Structure formats: C-alpha cells, structure tokens
RNA sequence: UAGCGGCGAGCGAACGGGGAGCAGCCCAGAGCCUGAAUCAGUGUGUGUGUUAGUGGAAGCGUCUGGAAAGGCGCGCGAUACAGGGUGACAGCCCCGUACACAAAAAUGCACAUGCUGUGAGCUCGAUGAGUAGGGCGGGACACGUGGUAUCCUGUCUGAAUAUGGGGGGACCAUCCUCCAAGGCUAAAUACUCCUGACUGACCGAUAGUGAACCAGUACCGUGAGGGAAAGGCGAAAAGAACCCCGGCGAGGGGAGUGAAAAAGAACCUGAAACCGUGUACGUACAAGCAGUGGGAGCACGCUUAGGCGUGUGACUGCGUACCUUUUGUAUAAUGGGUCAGCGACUUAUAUUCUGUAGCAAGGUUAACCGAAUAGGGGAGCCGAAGGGAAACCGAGUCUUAACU
C-alpha cells in the first residue's frame, strides 16, 4: 500500500489487508454502539414499593367502606409512593470480541484512507508549550478539526492542545473508534502508523 | 443465577448422539413372577424418549 | 374521612 | 429518562374533540363521551354511504314510476319495455329527465311502448 | 461518519410491548389469554409438572451409577497429535499443549483423522486404527 | 458437577487450576552469655498533607433591541474554552479555572535520630489428660443417621505419651503425611451517620428524600406510632406619590413605574372540566344512545355575477352507548360524576431458539495487571466421537455364548 505523505512526499508500505481493505459498515456500527454504550456510568436509582418511607398498615377496612380496596400507601398506583419497576444502578458495558474491535479499527482506517482524510506526516511536534504556535501551525496545513495522533507523547505537544477545542492529541496506544470517525481529519506520525500497523495486525 | 437441574431427572435420562434421550422402562422393579417373559425381555433394553414427553425433558434438565 | 362507619345491616333473606 | 405525557394527551384528546364539534351535551365537551360519540358517528358514516345508493335508488324509481304512470304505463312495463328496445339509460338520468323535461321522457315512454307492445 | 452509520437489515427487532392499545395486537392481556393460572402475575406451573399427574421423571426408574474414573480420562483425536512439541507424546506434554487438562490421568487416541508427522506416543493407549495411522504415517507407539 | 433429598420440592460442595496480598513467631525453661533483633510509649528535627489564603492572561466599533454576552466587520489570550453570574447565548465584564507560591499555631503521616520501657544467639532440655477417644441425646459439615468418616458438644466414663498419637470419607493391614489438648500477628476484605471535590443517555415540584417553602412540622392517636399540603412578580421594588366612588373598608377606575401591570403581590406561561355575557341560526303539535345519509330556509364573508366558504338545521330514511365477563348484553349484569396529572409485561443472571456480525475446525476469554472502553491474562468453557450402568472399547459400540 502507498501511504504517500504530503510534506516529505514519500511512500509508506503497509499491509493491504490491514489498511487498504474493505469497509464493513454494520461491524463499525457495532463497535461504536458498544463503545458509546461503554461510556455510560448509569447511576440511576428510583425506589419501589418497598423503599418509600411509609407504613404497612392498611389505610382502611377491606370490606364495607365505599372506597376501592387498598392495602398499602406505598402502592405504585397512589400518589407519593410508587415506581412499580424501579430501576437500579447497572452496568451497560457490553462485550465485543477482540477481533471485531481490531478488525473494525482496520475498517475505519480503510474508510479514512479511501476518503483522503487520514494524513500521514513524519515527526510532527510543537516547539514551545504555547497554543499560539498550534494556532498558526494548524492554520497552515488547513486543519480545522483533527486527531493529531503520535507514538511518543510529551509535555511539549500535549500541553499545547489541552485548550484547543477541535484538537485532541492521543498516544498511539490510545486510539478509539469514536475518535477516528468523530474527527474531520486525522494526522499521523510515521512512527504512529508504524505502531498501529503492529497493534491492529 | 444459573439454572438448577431437576436432579431426579438427571438420574433417569441420558443424552444420546443426535440430541435425544434414553431411559429405562418402568415395569421391572417388583411383582415379576406373574409377568410373561416376552414382556420382561422387551423392557430390558434402554429406550428413547417420545417427542410428546421430550419438551418436558428439554425443559427440566437444561444442561445434559 | 378518617372514620368510615359500618354499613347499615342488610335485609335478612336467609 | 422519565417521560411525561401531558403535551401529547392534549393532541389526542383535542383531536377527538375537534371532530366531535357540534354534538349535543357532553358529546362536544367531555372527551370520555366524545370519543364514544366520534366512533359511533364513524360507523354511521360508514353504513350510510352504503345506504345512500339504495336510498337514492328508490327515490329515482319512485320518480320514474310516478311520471310513467302520468304518461300511461307502469314502471315494470316501462323497464321491460326499455330493456327490449336495448336502451342503456339508467334510473338516475331517467329520473332526472322526468322532472325537468316531460317531453323527451314522453318519447322515451313511446320507445318503451314500441318495442314492448 | 458518526451520523451515517447504521446496522444491517434485521439486526434489531424491537420487541413485543404488551398492553398498548388495540392495534398493536398484543395489547389488553397482551398475548396471555383470558383467565387462569397462566394468565396471572407469576403464574404458570414449574418445570416437568404434568398438572398433578405423576411426572415423567418420576414414573420412570433411575438407572446407572456415576463412575469416578470417567472424570479423570480424556479422548484424544489425531488432529491435535501433531500440536504437541515436535515428535514425542506422553500424558504430560499433552497437558502443556492444553488439549487434555490438568486433572487428567488417563488417555486414549481415536482415529479421528490425518496424523502427519513422525510421532512418538508413549504411555497413552492407542486403540486399533489410529495405531495403523501413526504407524502408517511412520510413527511408533511403545507401551 | 459429585452428592444430599417424603431421592419429591429443592439444597449444593470439594479436589485441583488462575488471581489480589503475602510475614512470621512466642509461652509451657533453666544454664551461658547478656542491653544482641524489633516493636510499646515519650523527646527534638527533616520532609509530606489538612485546618486560613495570595497572584492569576486577553475586545472594540456599528445593527435591531427594554437591555447584548446575539448579528455581520475586525483584533488578541490560551500549561486558562472546567463551571457560575452578569438586563438575551461571553475565552477577552465579574468570580474563577490552568498554573505558581504561601502558615504564627495545632496537627495527621513517613521515617531520621536520640530516650523511658520491655529482651536476641548458641548448647542442652521440655514438648499442653479428665483433654483425645467411647456409649447416650442433639447440632455444624452440600451430607436429612444412612454403610457415615471429620468437628462442636448437655450426660457418664476414659488412653498412650514420640518405641506414642491424629488424619488420609464405614473398617482393618501396609505406606504417606502431620503432630492437637496455650497463645499472638499486618495485607488483600466488608460498611458509610458523616467531610471534600467531581460525575450522571437519573428527577425537575402529583416527579426526586416524607420534607426545594423554620418538615418529621402542623394535624391525628392514651401511647407506641402515623404523618401531610405548600416552589417561580420583574433585570432592578422602580412593589403603585397623587385624585375619585366606597364604610379614615374590601374592592375598583384614572395617573405613575416598567419593555410589557390581559407581569399588581390572589403576581412567568395559564390547558381542560365548570360557570357566564354578546351575535348568528334552530325550537313552544311534538316522542326515543340524540348521530348519520338527504335537505329547505336563514345570517355572514366571496368572487364571479353563478356557484362556492362557514354556522345553524326545519323535514325525512336508518340508527338500543363504551368496557369487562360470557353460549349470549340495548341489557333492568359489572365499572366510570367530569376534567387534569400519575397508573400495570421491567431489571439482573443462566439456558434454548431465530435474525445479524466477526472468526472458522476452531471460537472465546472470567477474575486480575493496565498512562487503563487499548493491550496483556487461554485459568477455563463449548466444539470437532460416539456406545455402555461401568471398567472398557472406539467409527464403531452395547446386548448376548454368539447374533441371519
């Protein structure tokens, strides 16, 4: 495969089956549903008819009163006492197969390549810890919203993008399938592509 | 929690090759000297569960 | 109402 | 995420009360009676389209029969008589003529009588 | 692409929602019929219960015992006979290739099919025909 | 799973395997040496955190607008675009946040270093008896006394003492292994009345604490105990100076504030049932789930100048509500006075099937480690082989002396 850069204008030979392969849509949807559904902490709780602060004495007689039968004030048909199926804190975190995660990352790398969105550069870092430099610098390449993903993270580059909105600078260990779609361009170090070729495999 | 087997069914049914079940015949424990010998030989092999009572067995023992 | 009285007894019929 | 349903029951209950507009009593006011009014007023509007064809049909047959007995023949003689001359005019137009123009109707009685008798 | 993704046709199915109207179908009793025990909250009988009749697993007599030895033995194919380490095969070293398990103390070999290498099986108990397939491929089985 | 079990309902291990965490000793003892290890508890000092805190970047002009933080034009700050408030939605108005320091004192901690106080190392011994075990009656073991080992025992007895004893699931014999009848010991472990910050495909006033409002209060009960309802003027009170009717009223109409007083304290929005006033049309000789199909006349708006649009509806055909339960309901069978809000197939974990996606004779990991939704972890589960009660055999196998 021919990853030609745009600044050094050099080829980069990677695995066709890893990188220039098919795009399975309904797998990528599965990993993004399972990932965003892994993002939920899900700390909801209501209370049933056994936690409402009340009593258990029947409000009135069973028979002879004109009113409908009722047995507890905590019943879920009454006001202020209720929630027949009250929800609890749960785990919405759902499991993927490992090969579907790695494979679907290979598929979205394929889709980012065939759309001329994924950008390979060589070693690409900032010089001083100042976001002013990254403003001109990402003005120059015409990069509005990116994923500056590198293989060696430092205090120089990461601090210079902690306050940019549309910029997220990750470690090549930590790419995730909602970012590689949720950014408009992606720019990579050649070392970062060198590692993602290994990890996705 | 995982399902608990009807344990008295695990001691009486035993899975076969194609997913069926074999069992014993239920007339050979007591009161035997009156029964004909043809009748008692035809109870000595193990036999398979009928499909009328196969859903009960698939329900009751859920692992084997 | 807190106090609901016992209903007026039925006509026998037994 | 808890779902409140106030603003949609407005739309259902008011959609019912707009159709029930014009009805006597609680049938235009109260929803619980107006729904029961609208349904029954849907059944009647379904059956009376079927009855509309028959209720105009005997109106037409009464017009033709009355004017035809003015012009000296019954309805049944007039309709076998129209069938014999192979005349494909329906009861609708033929009832329409006898009100407005007696004379083309009268010649149509003559064409009933010619093939008939 | 994050608003253009979509699942395949028939992946989701969206469930029977009981007790919602007439036109849903399964509304007003929702699928469970009119009166009776199966129509109640938590109703319906337990497993195997034939409505009072003596059940199927109690009419029939219990047979057999449960052998203790049948746990600690294994049934080796010929497929995973090459997977071991090169060319020699015993109880242990089948246990490190993880085809038999750690508790297991006895082992045979079944003509399942296609052994390839020169194999030296030791201490296992190869039947009749996998004998002819290990010998026929060139290996040898000593006791 | 093995088992246990009126062998029913149900109860349910272990061995062994992976992991978090690891730490060992002391008395039943005298002699020797003897402050030899480390703790218990004081003293000072070094750091480290809490109990107050400090600094903390950078914007203007026009357009509507009550007012700008909004619009377009044009500049900058960002190891600060986490939040909150400001007359409408603010990186550059304010508080902050990033970050950077700071404590007289009282301290929590780590240990440094003294100091009261307690005692290592060798050689030789010693090695826990009314206890183990047993009978009787019970209990805990997954084990319901069963062929039931192990442990705790209320009652009565009652060993040997390292040449001895206990266990190895009735018991005996051989082996293996450990040595009770005296103790102590962190860490992984569970819990949150409370304290701090942060977070939510959790609630937003019939919800969420019972309680957003001096709520466990009013109020009820002899007492235990029960136990509510109740948020919102506006940006700012600028919350109405003054005048008039009226009882030095309540209430109201003018003025006046305000963008708005149909925002006036009974205060944002203001739905429905319910109750009126005004117009149009219908009705006082006409019987009935009150509508529906046909349709006169009338009253308004239309544009062509004749039919629309809308409202009412004379007169006429037909027409016994809705739900539930039933063989069957107009039913004189049940239910609903009406409106408005709430009100019932959920969730967790296993198994079976169908769709779909990945991989494929392989598929897949659980706990846990983790700069951590990645990657490691293959402990394990299901499969690719079945037959038999079982040893055992194996594309066969079982029955049987063998099977046509």
Tab-separated table of C-alpha atoms (C1' of nucleotides) in Angstrom, chain F residues 5-386:
chain	number	residue	atom	x	y	z
F	5	G	C1'	-33.045	-35.119	49.405
F	6	G	C1'	-41.005	-37.514	51.791
F	7	C	C1'	-34.290	-39.328	46.404
F	8	G	C1'	-40.094	-35.075	45.910
F	9	A	C1'	-39.871	-29.532	46.156
F	10	G	C1'	-35.379	-28.186	46.344
F	11	C	C1'	-30.125	-27.790	48.767
F	12	G	C1'	-25.289	-27.866	46.791
F	13	A	C1'	-19.623	-28.738	47.513
F	14	A	C1'	-14.635	-30.254	47.046
F	15	C	C1'	-10.021	-31.730	44.734
F	16	G	C1'	-7.308	-29.120	41.621
F	17	G	C1'	-6.302	-24.559	38.407
F	18	G	C1'	-5.821	-18.862	37.781
F	19	G	C1'	-5.564	-14.233	40.508
F	20	A	C1'	-5.308	-9.652	44.568
F	21	G	C1'	-1.871	-9.900	49.082
F	22	C	C1'	1.946	-12.034	51.364
F	23	A	C1'	5.058	-12.460	57.414
F	24	G	C1'	6.059	-14.707	60.839
F	25	C	C1'	6.672	-16.063	65.595
F	26	C	C1'	6.019	-16.632	71.301
F	27	C	C1'	4.856	-19.311	76.220
F	28	A	C1'	4.697	-24.463	78.655
F	29	G	C1'	12.843	-23.136	80.508
F	30	A	C1'	16.817	-23.330	83.371
F	31	G	C1'	22.410	-22.535	82.328
F	32	C	C1'	25.558	-19.442	79.275
F	33	C	C1'	26.213	-15.047	77.636
F	34	U	C1'	23.795	-10.762	78.364
F	35	G	C1'	21.116	-4.195	76.737
F	36	A	C1'	22.325	-8.753	70.630
F	37	A	C1'	16.511	-8.077	66.959
F	38	U	C1'	12.066	-5.278	66.721
F	39	C	C1'	8.120	-3.326	68.493
F	40	A	C1'	5.103	-0.331	73.090
F	41	G	C1'	5.491	4.953	74.821
F	42	U	C1'	7.739	9.533	75.153
F	43	G	C1'	11.547	13.967	73.099
F	44	U	C1'	13.565	17.035	69.136
F	45	G	C1'	14.352	17.937	63.994
F	46	U	C1'	13.753	16.849	58.291
F	47	G	C1'	10.488	16.416	54.727
F	48	U	C1'	4.721	15.403	53.403
F	49	G	C1'	-0.812	16.592	53.659
F	50	U	C1'	-5.131	19.038	56.204
F	51	U	C1'	-7.107	23.385	59.259
F	52	A	C1'	-6.934	30.475	56.913
F	53	G	C1'	-5.105	32.063	51.913
F	54	U	C1'	-2.253	35.275	47.502
F	55	G	C1'	-1.324	36.443	42.439
F	56	G	C1'	-3.771	34.664	38.327
F	57	A	C1'	-3.889	36.134	30.562
F	58	A	C1'	-6.632	38.701	26.759
F	59	G	C1'	-12.165	43.312	22.793
F	60	C	C1'	-13.876	47.033	20.364
F	61	G	C1'	-16.947	49.826	16.746
F	62	U	C1'	-21.717	49.655	14.347
F	63	C	C1'	-27.342	46.771	13.541
F	64	U	C1'	-32.049	45.843	15.510
F	65	G	C1'	-33.233	45.521	20.519
F	66	G	C1'	-36.207	47.310	27.165
F	67	A	C1'	-31.139	45.728	27.851
F	68	A	C1'	-26.353	42.467	24.484
F	69	A	C1'	-22.857	38.347	26.239
F	70	G	C1'	-26.890	37.924	19.868
F	71	G	C1'	-25.679	39.833	14.044
F	72	C	C1'	-22.160	40.790	10.406
F	73	G	C1'	-16.924	43.573	10.421
F	74	C	C1'	-12.436	43.437	12.726
F	75	G	C1'	-8.200	42.147	16.998
F	76	C	C1'	-5.991	39.276	20.857
F	77	G	C1'	-5.299	35.387	25.445
F	78	A	C1'	-4.996	30.046	25.960
F	79	U	C1'	0.278	24.520	30.740
F	80	A	C1'	-6.517	29.112	31.481
F	81	C	C1'	-12.627	27.262	26.097
F	82	A	C1'	-13.929	23.095	33.823
F	83	G	C1'	-18.074	25.779	35.790
F	84	G	C1'	-21.106	30.082	37.825
F	85	G	C1'	-23.163	35.061	37.485
F	86	U	C1'	-23.947	39.380	34.761
F	87	G	C1'	-30.838	43.212	31.801
F	88	A	C1'	-30.987	37.749	25.675
F	89	C	C1'	-26.402	32.856	24.213
F	90	A	C1'	-19.468	35.845	26.722
F	91	G	C1'	-12.395	32.655	26.220
F	92	C	C1'	-11.079	38.556	26.426
F	93	C	C1'	-17.325	42.238	32.204
F	94	C	C1'	-17.085	39.697	37.350
F	95	C	C1'	-15.957	35.143	40.408
F	96	G	C1'	-12.948	31.682	38.906
F	97	U	C1'	-10.152	27.749	36.299
F	98	A	C1'	-4.781	26.354	34.260
F	99	C	C1'	-0.638	27.142	36.789
F	100	A	C1'	2.692	29.311	40.616
F	101	C	C1'	3.777	30.116	45.770
F	102	A	C1'	2.405	30.791	50.910
F	103	A	C1'	1.281	29.125	57.993
F	104	A	C1'	2.221	32.129	63.959
F	105	A	C1'	-0.031	27.755	65.528
F	106	A	C1'	-2.459	22.886	66.118
F	107	U	C1'	-1.623	18.784	63.506
F	108	G	C1'	-2.276	13.706	60.508
F	109	C	C1'	1.835	10.861	58.143
F	110	A	C1'	6.648	8.812	56.711
F	111	C	C1'	10.551	7.727	58.749
F	112	A	C1'	15.823	10.230	60.502
F	113	U	C1'	17.807	10.488	65.176
F	114	G	C1'	18.113	10.216	70.459
F	115	C	C1'	15.307	8.295	75.108
F	116	U	C1'	11.920	5.530	79.290
F	117	G	C1'	10.399	0.764	78.956
F	118	U	C1'	10.278	-4.232	77.569
F	119	G	C1'	14.604	-8.689	75.545
F	120	A	C1'	18.214	-11.582	70.668
F	121	G	C1'	22.149	-16.037	69.722
F	122	C	C1'	24.177	-20.804	70.963
F	123	U	C1'	24.228	-25.576	73.799
F	124	C	C1'	21.191	-28.804	76.397
F	125	G	C1'	16.338	-29.945	77.688
F	126	A	C1'	10.819	-29.511	77.637
F	127	U	C1'	7.015	-30.580	74.162
F	128	G	C1'	-0.061	-28.546	76.753
F	129	A	C1'	-5.099	-35.574	80.161
F	130	G	C1'	-10.289	-35.514	82.996
F	131	U	C1'	-8.119	-33.452	77.431
F	132	A	C1'	-8.197	-37.456	72.514
F	133	G	C1'	-11.423	-41.465	72.117
F	134	G	C1'	-16.200	-44.244	73.565
F	135	G	C1'	-21.613	-45.121	74.795
F	136	C	C1'	-26.408	-41.987	75.030
F	137	G	C1'	-29.200	-37.286	73.048
F	138	G	C1'	-28.500	-33.144	69.694
F	139	G	C1'	-26.098	-29.714	66.374
F	140	A	C1'	-22.310	-27.820	62.057
F	141	C	C1'	-20.471	-30.076	57.945
F	142	A	C1'	-23.501	-29.651	50.483
F	143	C	C1'	-24.332	-34.704	53.586
F	144	G	C1'	-31.964	-35.254	56.187
F	145	U	C1'	-28.168	-41.323	60.585
F	146	G	C1'	-27.919	-43.553	56.098
F	147	G	C1'	-22.852	-48.488	55.027
F	148	U	C1'	-21.181	-42.083	57.538
F	149	A	C1'	-15.579	-40.943	58.442
F	150	U	C1'	-14.362	-35.131	60.325
F	151	C	C1'	-15.707	-31.088	64.168
F	152	C	C1'	-18.658	-28.881	68.414
F	153	U	C1'	-20.707	-30.864	72.181
F	154	G	C1'	-25.520	-31.487	77.581
F	155	U	C1'	-24.695	-36.664	80.456
F	156	C	C1'	-21.441	-40.952	82.156
F	157	U	C1'	-16.764	-42.795	81.615
F	158	G	C1'	-11.843	-42.569	79.846
F	159	A	C1'	-5.770	-43.557	76.592
F	160	A	C1'	-0.730	-43.751	75.207
F	161	U	C1'	2.895	-40.086	75.698
F	162	A	C1'	7.260	-39.545	70.215
F	163	U	C1'	9.400	-47.352	70.660
F	164	G	C1'	3.377	-42.811	71.085
F	165	G	C1'	-0.559	-40.178	68.706
F	166	G	C1'	-4.408	-37.968	64.609
F	167	G	C1'	-5.882	-37.824	59.513
F	168	G	C1'	-5.952	-39.967	54.618
F	169	G	C1'	-14.958	-40.412	53.997
F	170	A	C1'	-17.630	-47.025	57.471
F	171	C	C1'	-13.493	-50.573	58.975
F	172	C	C1'	-8.758	-53.330	59.087
F	173	A	C1'	-3.463	-54.007	57.263
F	174	U	C1'	0.815	-51.565	54.770
F	175	C	C1'	2.514	-46.733	53.203
F	176	C	C1'	2.236	-41.313	53.126
F	177	U	C1'	1.689	-37.009	55.897
F	178	C	C1'	1.093	-34.085	60.248
F	179	C	C1'	1.967	-33.561	65.466
F	180	A	C1'	-3.786	-31.099	68.914
F	181	A	C1'	-5.431	-30.688	74.418
F	182	G	C1'	-1.841	-22.492	75.250
F	183	G	C1'	-1.389	-18.103	72.563
F	184	C	C1'	-0.410	-13.668	69.292
F	185	U	C1'	0.107	-11.351	64.096
F	186	A	C1'	-0.474	-6.945	59.196
F	187	A	C1'	-2.246	-7.007	53.742
F	188	A	C1'	-5.715	-8.068	50.163
F	189	U	C1'	-11.877	-7.991	52.854
F	190	A	C1'	-16.758	-5.692	54.027
F	191	C	C1'	-19.526	-0.786	55.573
F	192	U	C1'	-20.865	4.934	55.057
F	193	C	C1'	-24.493	8.586	60.317
F	194	C	C1'	-20.577	11.968	58.372
F	195	U	C1'	-16.345	15.510	55.406
F	196	G	C1'	-14.253	17.231	50.491
F	197	A	C1'	-14.366	17.719	45.224
F	198	C	C1'	-16.044	15.557	40.850
F	199	U	C1'	-19.609	12.730	37.691
F	200	G	C1'	-24.668	11.151	35.581
F	201	A	C1'	-28.421	8.619	27.888
F	202	C	C1'	-31.013	9.932	36.855
F	203	C	C1'	-35.652	13.572	38.923
F	204	G	C1'	-37.379	18.698	37.923
F	205	A	C1'	-42.441	20.281	42.360
F	206	U	C1'	-48.742	14.569	41.782
F	207	A	C1'	-41.521	13.673	39.983
F	208	G	C1'	-36.919	13.366	43.192
F	209	U	C1'	-35.774	12.497	50.198
F	210	G	C1'	-41.673	12.121	53.810
F	211	A	C1'	-39.561	17.361	53.538
F	212	A	C1'	-36.577	22.579	47.374
F	213	C	C1'	-41.191	26.681	51.115
F	214	C	C1'	-38.341	27.406	60.175
F	215	A	C1'	-40.935	19.189	57.927
F	216	G	C1'	-40.593	14.689	60.595
F	217	U	C1'	-43.509	20.387	61.198
F	218	A	C1'	-48.795	21.264	61.544
F	219	C	C1'	-52.604	17.714	62.425
F	220	C	C1'	-54.278	12.608	64.343
F	221	G	C1'	-53.554	8.974	68.487
F	222	U	C1'	-53.920	7.403	75.710
F	223	G	C1'	-49.232	5.713	73.919
F	224	A	C1'	-46.169	3.008	70.607
F	225	G	C1'	-46.760	5.159	66.132
F	226	G	C1'	-48.690	7.668	61.861
F	227	G	C1'	-47.963	11.867	59.071
F	228	A	C1'	-49.171	15.790	55.040
F	229	A	C1'	-50.095	20.098	51.708
F	230	A	C1'	-47.029	24.022	50.420
F	231	G	C1'	-41.669	26.493	44.690
F	232	G	C1'	-41.447	30.796	40.290
F	233	C	C1'	-43.507	39.451	40.059
F	234	G	C1'	-39.562	41.560	37.397
F	235	A	C1'	-33.279	42.770	35.026
F	236	A	C1'	-33.898	46.153	39.173
F	237	A	C1'	-39.024	47.040	44.256
F	238	A	C1'	-38.627	51.188	40.425
F	239	G	C1'	-43.981	46.952	44.630
F	240	A	C1'	-48.059	51.730	42.959
F	241	A	C1'	-46.843	59.566	45.060
F	242	C	C1'	-51.436	61.697	43.915
F	243	C	C1'	-57.021	62.104	42.555
F	244	C	C1'	-62.344	59.748	42.548
F	245	C	C1'	-66.698	56.078	44.131
F	246	G	C1'	-66.929	53.190	48.583
F	247	G	C1'	-67.997	52.308	55.483
F	248	C	C1'	-60.417	57.458	57.641
F	249	G	C1'	-63.323	49.424	54.068
F	250	A	C1'	-62.617	45.325	50.986
F	251	G	C1'	-62.675	46.105	46.027
F	252	G	C1'	-62.279	49.226	41.669
F	253	G	C1'	-61.359	53.195	37.580
F	254	G	C1'	-57.856	57.185	36.070
F	255	A	C1'	-52.385	58.695	36.867
F	256	G	C1'	-47.432	56.848	37.551
F	257	U	C1'	-43.014	52.918	37.396
F	258	G	C1'	-41.812	49.316	33.915
F	259	A	C1'	-40.064	46.587	27.505
F	260	A	C1'	-44.898	44.518	28.986
F	261	A	C1'	-49.419	45.829	35.312
F	262	A	C1'	-54.601	40.957	29.918
F	263	A	C1'	-46.152	40.672	34.798
F	264	G	C1'	-50.025	44.221	40.775
F	265	A	C1'	-48.038	40.738	45.185
F	266	A	C1'	-54.815	36.029	44.690
F	267	C	C1'	-48.291	38.013	40.768
F	268	C	C1'	-43.967	33.926	34.282
F	269	U	C1'	-46.747	30.548	30.808
F	270	G	C1'	-52.331	29.882	32.001
F	271	A	C1'	-54.823	23.912	29.280
F	272	A	C1'	-59.410	21.186	30.453
F	273	A	C1'	-63.860	20.051	33.075
F	274	C	C1'	-67.306	24.101	35.197
F	275	C	C1'	-69.852	28.982	35.123
F	276	G	C1'	-71.487	33.443	32.293
F	277	U	C1'	-72.336	37.948	28.550
F	278	G	C1'	-72.840	39.272	23.339
F	279	U	C1'	-74.072	37.975	17.954
F	280	A	C1'	-75.946	34.323	14.048
F	281	C	C1'	-79.349	30.342	13.348
F	282	G	C1'	-82.939	26.439	15.322
F	283	U	C1'	-87.171	25.330	18.928
F	284	A	C1'	-93.250	26.162	22.491
F	285	C	C1'	-98.461	19.898	17.899
F	286	A	C1'	-94.126	17.432	19.005
F	287	A	C1'	-91.768	11.348	21.315
F	288	G	C1'	-86.788	7.529	21.984
F	289	C	C1'	-77.944	6.230	22.538
F	290	A	C1'	-79.506	12.480	20.152
F	291	G	C1'	-75.976	10.737	15.444
F	292	U	C1'	-75.780	9.813	10.368
F	293	G	C1'	-77.097	9.973	4.754
F	294	G	C1'	-80.564	13.660	2.070
F	295	G	C1'	-82.033	18.713	2.531
F	296	A	C1'	-85.172	23.553	2.754
F	297	G	C1'	-84.713	28.257	4.746
F	298	C	C1'	-81.883	31.966	7.171
F	299	A	C1'	-77.021	35.020	8.708
F	300	C	C1'	-72.423	36.226	7.307
F	301	G	C1'	-67.791	36.523	4.272
F	302	C	C1'	-66.505	35.508	-1.544
F	303	U	C1'	-65.611	36.326	-6.423
F	304	U	C1'	-67.899	35.635	-10.480
F	305	A	C1'	-72.095	37.668	-11.429
F	306	G	C1'	-73.296	31.645	-10.667
F	307	G	C1'	-71.998	28.701	-7.551
F	308	C	C1'	-68.885	28.389	-3.673
F	309	G	C1'	-66.818	29.067	2.063
F	310	U	C1'	-68.800	28.947	7.066
F	311	G	C1'	-72.543	28.471	11.001
F	312	U	C1'	-77.349	26.675	12.387
F	313	G	C1'	-80.571	22.965	10.739
F	314	A	C1'	-86.980	22.728	9.600
F	315	C	C1'	-88.477	17.934	7.424
F	316	U	C1'	-87.087	12.658	6.073
F	317	G	C1'	-84.569	7.173	5.652
F	318	C	C1'	-81.780	4.482	9.076
F	319	G	C1'	-79.954	4.084	13.983
F	320	U	C1'	-80.977	0.315	21.542
F	321	A	C1'	-73.946	3.901	24.435
F	322	C	C1'	-68.306	2.277	25.692
F	323	C	C1'	-65.584	-1.561	28.819
F	324	U	C1'	-65.363	-6.246	31.286
F	325	U	C1'	-67.423	-11.105	31.532
F	326	U	C1'	-69.638	-14.581	28.794
F	327	U	C1'	-73.043	-19.655	24.769
F	328	G	C1'	-75.291	-14.883	24.819
F	329	U	C1'	-75.742	-7.941	26.538
F	330	A	C1'	-79.754	-2.339	24.450
F	331	U	C1'	-79.483	-5.003	28.905
F	332	A	C1'	-83.192	-3.939	34.375
F	333	A	C1'	-75.188	-7.785	34.745
F	334	U	C1'	-70.085	-5.206	36.341
F	335	G	C1'	-67.357	-0.195	36.144
F	336	G	C1'	-66.958	5.020	35.364
F	337	G	C1'	-69.979	12.270	38.163
F	338	U	C1'	-66.379	15.116	34.743
F	339	C	C1'	-61.522	17.228	33.784
F	340	A	C1'	-56.167	17.426	34.510
F	341	G	C1'	-51.635	14.939	36.240
F	342	C	C1'	-49.695	9.944	37.716
F	343	G	C1'	-51.230	4.346	36.925
F	344	A	C1'	-49.538	-2.055	35.027
F	345	C	C1'	-45.025	-7.483	30.789
F	346	U	C1'	-39.413	-4.418	33.956
F	347	U	C1'	-34.353	-5.475	35.687
F	348	A	C1'	-30.291	-8.780	36.988
F	349	U	C1'	-28.145	-13.634	35.947
F	350	A	C1'	-28.195	-18.793	33.272
F	351	U	C1'	-30.110	-21.962	29.262
F	352	U	C1'	-32.754	-22.843	24.226
F	353	C	C1'	-34.175	-20.994	19.522
F	354	U	C1'	-34.414	-17.030	15.200
F	355	G	C1'	-32.114	-12.693	12.777
F	356	U	C1'	-27.404	-10.451	12.050
F	357	A	C1'	-21.977	-9.530	12.640
F	358	G	C1'	-16.830	-11.454	13.480
F	359	C	C1'	-13.776	-15.728	13.051
F	360	A	C1'	-13.811	-20.730	11.425
F	361	A	C1'	-12.256	-26.892	12.687
F	362	G	C1'	-11.619	-23.878	15.844
F	363	G	C1'	-14.301	-19.934	18.512
F	364	U	C1'	-13.675	-17.366	23.031
F	365	U	C1'	-11.863	-15.340	27.476
F	366	A	C1'	-13.592	-14.569	33.564
F	367	A	C1'	-11.339	-12.532	37.736
F	368	C	C1'	-6.830	-9.502	37.812
F	369	C	C1'	-2.457	-6.239	35.702
F	370	G	C1'	-3.036	-1.942	32.965
F	371	A	C1'	-0.812	6.343	31.108
F	372	A	C1'	-6.418	1.850	31.581
F	373	U	C1'	-13.535	1.025	26.808
F	374	A	C1'	-6.395	-0.413	24.415
F	375	G	C1'	-3.144	-4.278	25.337
F	376	G	C1'	-1.836	-8.488	28.326
F	377	G	C1'	-4.236	-12.795	31.245
F	378	G	C1'	-6.157	-19.286	27.204
F	379	A	C1'	-7.292	-20.262	34.271
F	380	G	C1'	-11.407	-22.070	31.573
F	381	C	C1'	-15.959	-23.141	28.631
F	382	C	C1'	-18.443	-25.066	24.243
F	383	G	C1'	-16.943	-27.961	19.680
F	384	A	C1'	-14.509	-31.302	16.332
F	385	A	C1'	-16.943	-39.088	18.549
F	386	G	C1'	-19.863	-41.967	19.870
